[PDB]
UniProtKB/Swiss-Prot annotation, chain A:
Molecular function per GO: rRNA binding; structural constituent of ribosome
Keyword terms, alphabetized: Acetylation, Cytoplasm, Isopeptide bond, Methylation, Ribonucleoprotein, Ribosomal protein, RNA-binding, rRNA-binding, Ubl conjugation
Family: Belongs to the universal ribosomal protein uS13 family.
Biological source species: Saccharomyces cerevisiae (strain ATCC 204508 / S288c) (Baker's yeast)
Cross-link (Glycyl lysine isopeptide (Lys-Gly) (interchain with G-Cter in ubiquitin)): 27, 40, 71, 87
Function in brief: Component of the ribosome, a large ribonucleoprotein complex responsible for the synthesis of proteins in the cell. The small ribosomal subunit (SSU) binds messenger RNAs (mRNAs) and translates the encoded message by selecting cognate aminoacyl-transfer RNA (tRNA) molecules. The large subunit (LSU) contains the ribosomal catalytic site termed the peptidyl transferase center (PTC), which catalyzes the formation of peptide bonds, thereby polymerizing the amino acids delivered by tRNAs into a polypeptide chain.
Name of the featured protein: Small ribosomal subunit protein uS13A
Cellular localization per UniProt: Cytoplasm
GO cellular component, one term: mitochondrion
Stretches of the chain forming a coiled coil according to its record: none
Keyword match Transcription: no
Positions of post-translational N6-methyllysine modification: 39
Post-translational modification: N-terminally acetylated by acetyltransferase NatA.
GO BP annotation list: cytoplasmic translation; endonucleolytic cleavage in ITS1 to separate SSU-rRNA from 5.8S rRNA and LSU-rRNA from tricistronic rRNA transcript (SSU-rRNA, 5.8S rRNA, LSU-rRNA); ribosomal subunit export from nucleus
Part of the intact protein present: 10 to 131 of 146
Curated annotation (Swiss-Prot), chain B:
Assembly and binders: Component of the small ribosomal subunit (SSU). Mature yeast ribosomes consist of a small (40S) and a large (60S) subunit. The 40S small subunit contains 1 molecule of ribosomal RNA (18S rRNA) and 33 different proteins (encoded by 57 genes). The large 60S subunit contains 3 rRNA molecules (25S, 5.8S and 5S rRNA) and 46 different proteins (encoded by 81 genes).
Miscellaneous note of the record: It is presumed that the precursor part of S25 is engaged in assembling of the small subunit, thus being essential in ribosome maturation. Present with 322000 molecules/cell in log phase SD medium.
Name of the molecule in the record: Small ribosomal subunit protein eS25A
Entry's Gene Ontology cellular component terms: cytosol; cytosolic small ribosomal subunit
UniProtKB/Swiss-Prot annotation, chain C:
Presence of keyword Nucleus: no
BP-aspect Gene Ontology terms: ribosomal small subunit assembly; ribosomal small subunit biogenesis; ribosomal subunit export from nucleus; translation
Protein name listed in UniProt: Small ribosomal subunit protein eS19A
Keywords: Cytoplasm, Ribonucleoprotein, Ribosomal protein, Ribosome biogenesis
Quaternary state and interactors: Component of the small ribosomal subunit (SSU). Mature yeast ribosomes consist of a small (40S) and a large (60S) subunit. The 40S small subunit contains 1 molecule of ribosomal RNA (18S rRNA) and 33 different proteins (encoded by 57 genes). The large 60S subunit contains 3 rRNA molecules (25S, 5.8S and 5S rRNA) and 46 different proteins (encoded by 81 genes).
From Swiss-Prot, chain D:
Family under the similarity heading: Belongs to the universal ribosomal protein uS19 family.
Gene Ontology CC terms, in alphabetical order: cytoplasm; cytosol; cytosolic small ribosomal subunit
Compartments in which it is found: Cytoplasm
Gene Ontology terms, MF aspect: RNA binding; structural constituent of ribosome
GO biological process, alphabetically ordered: cytoplasmic translation; ribosomal small subunit assembly; ribosomal subunit export from nucleus
Residues of the full protein shown: 14 to 129 of 142
Glycyl lysine isopeptide (Lys-Gly) (interchain with G-Cter in ubiquitin) cross-link, renumbered residues: 11, 22, 51
Superkingdom classification of source: Eukaryota
Role: Component of the ribosome, a large ribonucleoprotein complex responsible for the synthesis of proteins in the cell. The small ribosomal subunit (SSU) binds messenger RNAs (mRNAs) and translates the encoded message by selecting cognate aminoacyl-transfer RNA (tRNA) molecules. The large subunit (LSU) contains the ribosomal catalytic site termed the peptidyl transferase center (PTC), which catalyzes the formation of peptide bonds, thereby polymerizing the amino acids delivered by tRNAs into a polypeptide chain.
Subunit description: Component of the small ribosomal subunit (SSU). Mature yeast ribosomes consist of a small (40S) and a large (60S) subunit. The 40S small subunit contains 1 molecule of ribosomal RNA (18S rRNA) and 33 different proteins (encoded by 57 genes). The large 60S subunit contains 3 rRNA molecules (25S, 5.8S and 5S rRNA) and 46 different proteins (encoded by 81 genes).
Protein name: Small ribosomal subunit protein uS19
Amino acid sequence: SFQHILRLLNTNVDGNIKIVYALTTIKGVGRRYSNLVCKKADVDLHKRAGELTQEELERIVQIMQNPTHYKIPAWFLNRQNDITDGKDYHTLANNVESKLRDDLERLKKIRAHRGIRHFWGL
Amino acid sequence: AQHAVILDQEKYDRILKEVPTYRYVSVSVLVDRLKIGGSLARIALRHLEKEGIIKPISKHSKQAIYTRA
Amino acid sequence: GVSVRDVAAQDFINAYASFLQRQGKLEVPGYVDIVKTSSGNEMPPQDAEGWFYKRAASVARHIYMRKQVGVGKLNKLYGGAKSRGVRPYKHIDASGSINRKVLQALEKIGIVEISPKGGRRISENGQRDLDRIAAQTLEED
Amino acid sequence: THSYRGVDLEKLLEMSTEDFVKLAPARVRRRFARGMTSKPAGFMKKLRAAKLAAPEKPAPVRTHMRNMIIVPEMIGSVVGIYNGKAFNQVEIRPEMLGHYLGEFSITYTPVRHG
RNA sequence: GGAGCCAGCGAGUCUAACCUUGGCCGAGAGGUCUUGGUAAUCUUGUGAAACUCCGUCGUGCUGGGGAUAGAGCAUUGUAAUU
């Protein structure tokens, strides 16, 4: 039954830890984001992560990447009012450090001070 | 090694026979000579006291003191 | 006879909060479980369901013992220290939006009423209600 | 194509300034709401004529106005931006929208301990 | 995390706009309509923090620690880009 290791969003998560805290291994999932997602999923916050069933790890993932569908208040999100299109996003896993290392290069292309100083230090 | 955080049937059987042996029991004692994590020990004491196997003398959240009787 | 002053604080409050929740008339704001209750806090309230009832009880008692109170004084009362990172700690007030709705809710069930000279004062029905729970709490001993 | 916060470039250029600010972040909105000074108007007037009479690019107009917001009306102009000492010459590409002019002219020289 | 709950020394507008209670809106920062005080009189019992009680965590750079950095929302100012 109990599984000592699990894998989701291409990240490893160990079962021995409280579910709310275990999830924070994923880039972009902080303590508060993790806490609210669990409540919306109505999982038992006091369970340890290795106890959850597959159809409970789904729904969780299905919320983390669609937060606006469950009326999380948008002011909770880390990519409000995107520069290209005015959508609100939350950035997860390897997608973080791809929008980073992109806005830095976008500044470099336009010869802005902040871009210049950054790459000059490198 | 790591302390256990979920209760297997073997340790449950172990707890019920071993704990009545000790003069003094506390969170620290169960974590030491048994190998459960601290979050189990807080649950075990409330259960064993309710069940009547150990006798309280004082309770303080940050300390607890139970005796053989 | 018995008065609220005859009972220990964190014993009256637990009893009354449990009672008040069972009646189910106390209207909750609905944004509960997102809010931190303070800009000084980290993490939301740990008792996810009950915490709104607990505060409703505390406010009622605090007003009963006093002449009148307003929302601003409650924010000072429930404030705390904020860490401010590497700089030294400082006092910070609690959320206004929580406390304001608490007072509005209690007023609908008639425990509290608006006072002249501003703020809120205990209603005579508030006295009668709280005095009854006090008696039960001692009698349970 | 380039797009600015969901609006396509071909609908820009036709856009007025007071429409543009509705899309802009908080600092820009405050700056215009608090009332931008008269000084940009004199610059814009001169800048407009150089474009209108242009033979094909308008050639530089130069200014000390480092605190001025880039606004779609001035896309494609060539501007010399003062540095406290010299002038640096820059052409307004669409990617520049919403920045300050001062960000494109560096007031100090990198230190090397060489 | 929830609950309990206690000081002393200061300073404040008509020259005009200082210290601000109370009601309403907002997750928050904050906004808005009124009000008392030229003060042992009103803000102010400055209901301060450490602290006390009940829970969660369990010795793992961990839920210790919060530098560096990204996105967004406000306030002062003629002007916040370095």
